Design a protein around this ligand. Structure first.
Ligand SMILES: *CC(=O)N(c1ccc(F)cc1)[C@@H]1C=CS(=O)(=O)C1
Ligand SMILES: *CC(=O)N(c1ccc(F)cc1)[C@@H]1C=CS(=O)(=O)C1
Lengths: 304, 304
């Protein structure tokens, strides 16, 4: 019993983190096989970041301008290329700690662990979600750029995020490992505002199932609803519309608890309309939306 | 910017986790040098757990009854001893991934990361606190016993917790790595109730400093208080009494923000007396008490 915001174990990713220095800019890179991935802004001064021309900035950079350090051992750079908003630095040595891995571009509402790093050195690990507005709510200081987000399926690390930007509102923007930003964000120090931070409705419902499974049942009511009726309440409270896909995805939790998805929706509806009345659910005073149905099943069944 | 419930990177501890099987009981052990540490209840059936005599149960056990598996490689057990509520299994092979480590017995209010494991395989990592009632609020299924809690100071892992017990109220009890339970808990399936879960006042104040540092300032008020006046409000709300030691410990955060500790206490006092009025602080709708002053400084300054 107990339900906690749980990150994946970080060891497989710890073994991939390096320091990348270009001129006087230092951040983190990801060493997989004989390639180091890092944000392309490694070639910028903060002055450059106002209106960088990356192709032009890159022309002034050679392989030997990219200083790559893995602990206290320097890697030899034998090639460099820009792919979207990341640099791929070819090094002469395959990372011996390269795990089985994939690059995956995740959808909003999907969760992942972030290994926060400074100078190629891990500081900590936490769980995030790709927000419906394609921001993440991270913890990232200066030097944290190139820290990555990942899921692990048994032995295979799926890299889904690299950290690039803090918006002036203190939320976070970044790319997949092909260097494509999530959402409309750009690696430029400009006016970029996040859209509505909508709540991930299917994740709240998953978490409500998690609560029932772990003894927190006070919010279960005598009501049901329909997707259409629920969705009118969702709209009002800036919740993502619930689809039949989401209902289908909640089927296993539905089955395990014997609470029909639409009954749990009716529970959520009352909670949105009435608030918590100073009560808590799984030690939270608001509706948590950064556990997927998959996360709840995983943590409730003890997958490794 | 951003402030998250951050666990230490888990790789150094991942490399110490093994599976321990005695007869038909399987749980997790910690392999450091040529010793595997695991809960002594590894020798029990659930039937035994009602009134176990561990010394008597142990007499029926030989070195070869302790099956120790590190990934898919079996360790040879060359000795076994009971120390309090843990077994030390001497194996013929030093763990090659043994990090620099200490065993430390932590105080209530102190935080640590838990690497949840099943069959010696890591499932996830989360941050905990030793509660004033010597429970932790974990996420532990059957098979999770012998999962450990740790802090990391640069290269040195300080092991402070091994998981033994779930109380019928779904909170968690365990030992330090010398096998001494935190609090009055015992490795027996009996009537054990947790005392008052008091809030760790110094941790709430640290977290309020963290919020100010990261832009959340609405709860800052025009008031101050005294330790004695604050403590009357603390009592009423089941908060730990604040000591001059706690004020001293908050000095660096005080200095960095320019908010006197007693002014932040007055802020906390108003929040306790008035609630949040449906507002949030660092994305929480209640007062978080599982960040130490040390945690806030660490995460706000980017220590690795
Ligand atoms: C994103 C980051 O970590 N930093 C950075 C790097 C390059 C830029 F153009 C902007 C920001 C950070 C700033 C100073 S540093 O020490 O080089 C790293
Ligand atoms: C604590 C734990 O993980 N388990 C356990 C072990 C021994 C006991 F006496 C009680 C509980 C868990 C129960 C079954 S198991 O698969 O052996 C592990």
């Amino acid at each position: 019993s107990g339900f906690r915001k749980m990150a994946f174990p970080s060891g497989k990713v710890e073994g991939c983190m390096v320091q990348v220095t270009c001129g006087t800019t230092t951040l983190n890179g990801l060493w997989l096989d004989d390639v180091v991935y890092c944000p392309r802004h490694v070639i910028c001064t903060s002055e450059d970041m106002l209106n960088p021309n990356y192709e032009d900035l890159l022309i002034r950079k050679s392989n030997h301008n990219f200083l790559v350090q893995a602990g206290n051992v320097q890697l030899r750079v034998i090639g460099h290329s820009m792919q979207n908003c990341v640099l791929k630095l070819k090094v002469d040595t395959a990372n011996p700690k390269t795990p089985k891995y994939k690059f995956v571009r995740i959808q909003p509402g999907q969760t992942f662990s972030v290994l926060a790093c400074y100078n190629g050195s891990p500081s900590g690990v936490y769980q995030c979600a790709m927000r419906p507005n394609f921001t993440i709510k991270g913890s990232f200081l200066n030097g944290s750029c190139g820290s990555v987000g990942f899921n692990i399926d048994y032995d295979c690390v799926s890299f889904c995020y690299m950290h690039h930007m803090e918006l002036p509102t203190g939320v976070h923007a970044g790319t997949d490992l092909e260097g494509n930003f999530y959402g409309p964000f750009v690696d430029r120090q400009t006016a970029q505002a996040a859209g509505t931070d909508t709540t991930i409705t299917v994740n709240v419902l998953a978490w409500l199932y998690a609560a029932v499974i772990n003894g927190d049942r006070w919010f279960l009511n005598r009501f049901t609803t329909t997707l259409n009726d629920f969705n009118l309440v969702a709209m009002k409270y800036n919740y993502e519309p619930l689809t039949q896909d989401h209902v289908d995805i909640l089927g296993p939790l539905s089955a395990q608890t014997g609470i029909a998805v639409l009954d749990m929706c009716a529970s959520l509806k009352e909670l949105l309309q009435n608030g918590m009345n100073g009560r808590t659910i799984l030690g939270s005073a608001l509706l948590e939306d950064e556990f997927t149905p998959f996360d709840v099943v995983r943590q409730c069944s003890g997958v490794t």
